[PDB]
């Protein structure tokens, strides 16, 4: 029967990332026997239109955090050639606090990523794939290079790439410690040998991207699932999760949980089931839970009142006023300082701003100072509303979406934990007068 209602119990027969835990050969031979690099020539020979259609039918949404529909976004490069080469860029930066999915995909299933690069480049008509990986992921990048080497030797990429007739290259470029370089345009700038400063849009990368050429930026998770969706088909991938929330998803459950880990799960699984089944629940019981950040630091946190009934997909968490983000659940129990955690996140954002645009460069540092004073209680209640307005000024007025990610956790803390702030201010005034 269609339109399921209780998502969140899928067996290992339907998991794309079968070597998530690295319990199986991470090299090619392993991948080959696990289903990787299968019927690639057939998929390539089906053409870009067929490949684009499969992505579209699946309903695949961008796993990098924004959730833009993947098929429509990849169809933006279906234009005829204009003399410029076309490129696919894989975003392997993984800078979001709480997020470790791309690291595991790269280190334990690199051939999935390489095949995803090949199929995505064929769909876009791209000439080569640049994989921008985090600089701190030295061993992951080296495993990726070993995988690309054994794919080149076996003729799975390079000239003709198959019995296919299509030439495709895969390059790995390492960053040097910059979270802002996860942004697609800032990533493009960092590939071209500049500071990782985001561009303004328009133009979008499909018009003017890397080296000024048409480019498509795709998250590692989005790229990896691309070949499994093609062989399995769009209809199969969709058969999971609610409407407009199709497919499976990697979740990183960390913080105050008994067994922090990462796990593949159906999209619309309830948060409570995910936390209590895979992560072993909250230390101190479920009633010890204080707050949850469902999608990495860039998303507003939610209190226990919402966490017990919210689904883990895009629209459900949007209705909870937070957002799915990178599907990186950070759990905080009743034993933590909720203001201190948000202050640390704001300090991270202050240290990660590129400084290009005025609202981010000035207001995030301003919010950091205000939040550090809030932690002690130095402030007055009239500043809390003031702080709210500061965030509003920052949000939607910056080039880059780092300003949004800095302003949203503060808004969440003020929306849900204002009384704690006020009582901290009252206490500081009481013992200071």
């Amino acid at each position: 029967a269609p339109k399921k209602t209780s998502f969140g119990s899928l067996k290992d027969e339907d998991r794309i990332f079968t070597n998530l835990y690295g319990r199986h050969d991470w090299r090619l031979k392993g991948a080959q026997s696990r289903g990787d690099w299968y019927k690639t020539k057939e998929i390539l020979l089906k053409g870009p239109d067929w490949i684009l259609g499969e992505v579209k039918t699946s309903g695949l949404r961008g796993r990098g955090g924004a959730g833009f529909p993947t098929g429509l976004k990849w169809s933006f490069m279906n234009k005829p050639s204009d003399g410029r080469p076309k490129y696919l860029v894989v975003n392997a930066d993984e800078g979001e606090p709480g997020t470790c999915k791309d690291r595991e995909i790269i280190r334990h299933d690199p051939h999935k990523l390489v095949e995803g690069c090949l199929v995505g480049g064929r769909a876009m008509g791209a000439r080569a794939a640049y994989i921008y990986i985090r600089g701190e992921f030295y061993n992951e990048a080296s495993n990726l290079q070993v995988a690309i080497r054994e794919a080149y030797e076996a003729g799975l990429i390079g000239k003709n790439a198959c019995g296919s007739g299509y030439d495709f290259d895969v390059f790995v470029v390492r960053g040097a410690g910059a979270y802002i370089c996860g942004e697609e345009t800032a990533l493009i700038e960092s590939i071209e040998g500049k500071q990782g400063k985001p561009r303004l849009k328009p133009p979008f990368p499909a018009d003017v991207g890397v080296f000024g050429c048409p480019t498509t930026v795709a998250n590692v998770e989005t790229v990896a699932v691309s070949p499994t969706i093609c062989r399995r088909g769009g209809a199969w991938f969709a058969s999971f999760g609610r409407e407009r929330n199709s497919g499976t998803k990697l979740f990183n459950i960390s913080g105050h949980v008994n067994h922090p880990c990462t796990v593949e799960e159906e999209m619309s699984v309830p948060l409570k089931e995910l936390i209590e089944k895979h992560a072993g629940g909250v230390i101190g019981g479920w009633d010890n839970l204080l707050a949850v950040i469902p999608g990495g630091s860039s998303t507003p946190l939610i209190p226990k009142s919402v966490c017990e009934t919210v689904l883990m997909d895009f629209d459900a968490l949007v209705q909870a006023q937070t957002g799915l983000g990178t599907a990186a659940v950070i759990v905080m129990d009743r034993s933590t300082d909720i203001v201190k955690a948000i202050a640390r996140l704001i300090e991270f954002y202050k240290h990660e701003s590129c400084g290009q645009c005025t609202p981010c460069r000035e207001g995030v540092d301003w919010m950091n100072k205000v939040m550090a004073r809030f932690v002690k209680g130095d402030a007055r209640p009239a500043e809390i509303d003031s702080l709210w307005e500061i965030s509003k000024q920052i949000e939607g007025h910056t080039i880059c979406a780092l300003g949004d990610g800095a302003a949203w956790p503060v808004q969440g803390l003020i929306r849900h934990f204002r009384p704690e702030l006020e009582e901290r201010m009252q206490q500081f005034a009481l013992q200071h007068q």
């Binding site: 998530l20 299968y38 061993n139 088909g233 955690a341 991270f348």
Partner: protein
């Protein structure tokens, strides 16, 4: 708090434009290989790796290294200065042989990262910005390293050491001092991103190739 590092350069007898720096011939072969990846006429794109390569041979980046990279790639030196001061992995000052980077962001802090930081400080006798007098270690704090599930974690010269405890961090320091190298990864009998006990999923044998393939392919 504040960065602490200055973003101007003042010449010193140990760091001036005449400080001796040059790539090894092997590093020149690697530079040629790095340059080839990018499209012709876009040679600058190699500023990020080649600069890193310099730091991998010298240990840090003297101003002469930046000048050499700028001259090799025919990029104006101020562009290389911009790249060097923007990215935090570039060392514009000498560091110890072992660069200890402990994560203190919120997911990593929630699992008692301060215990690790204090344990390192009391084991080495130095603070969160200083270098040990033997010039072997340098301790700093860093933002999220992407190993949050394994928090508390530390990064040392390209090796992650995760699921740390005060006793665990100290032993790694002991092993690094006595002239040995410690094995990277979790230090709690986990060796993965798996749940700490039970392996809630991925227990079935992996499916064979072509198992779920759709008709007409």
């Amino acid at each position: 708090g504040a960065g602490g590092a200055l973003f101007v350069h003042r010449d010193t007898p140990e760091n001036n434009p005449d400080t001796p720096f040059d790539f090894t011939p092997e590093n020149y072969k690697r530079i040629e290989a790095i340059v080839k990846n990018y499209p012709e006429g876009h040679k600058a794109a190699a500023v990020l790796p080649v600069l890193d390569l310099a730091q991998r041979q010298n240990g840090w980046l003297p101003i002469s290294a930046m000048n050499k990279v700028a001259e090799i790639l025919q990029v104006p030196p101020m562009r290389v200065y911009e790249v060097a001061t923007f990215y935090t992995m570039y060392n514009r000052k000498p560091v110890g042989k072992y660069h200890i980077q402990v994560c203190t962001t919120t997911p990593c802090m929630l699992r008692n990262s301060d215990s690790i930081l204090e344990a390192i400080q009391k084991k080495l006798g130095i603070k969160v910005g200083e270098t040990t007098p033997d010039k072997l270690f340098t301790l700093i704090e860093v933002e999220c390293l992407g190993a949050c599930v394994n928090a508390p974690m530390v990064q040392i010269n390209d090796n992650y050491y995760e699921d740390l405890t005060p006793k665990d961090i100290e032993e790694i320091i002991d092993e690094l001092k006595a002239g040995k190298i410690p094995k990277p990864g979790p230090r709690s009998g986990r060796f993965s991103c798996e749940p700490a006990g039970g392996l809630t999923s991925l227990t079935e044998p992996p499916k064979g190739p072509g198992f779920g393939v759709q008709a007409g392919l």
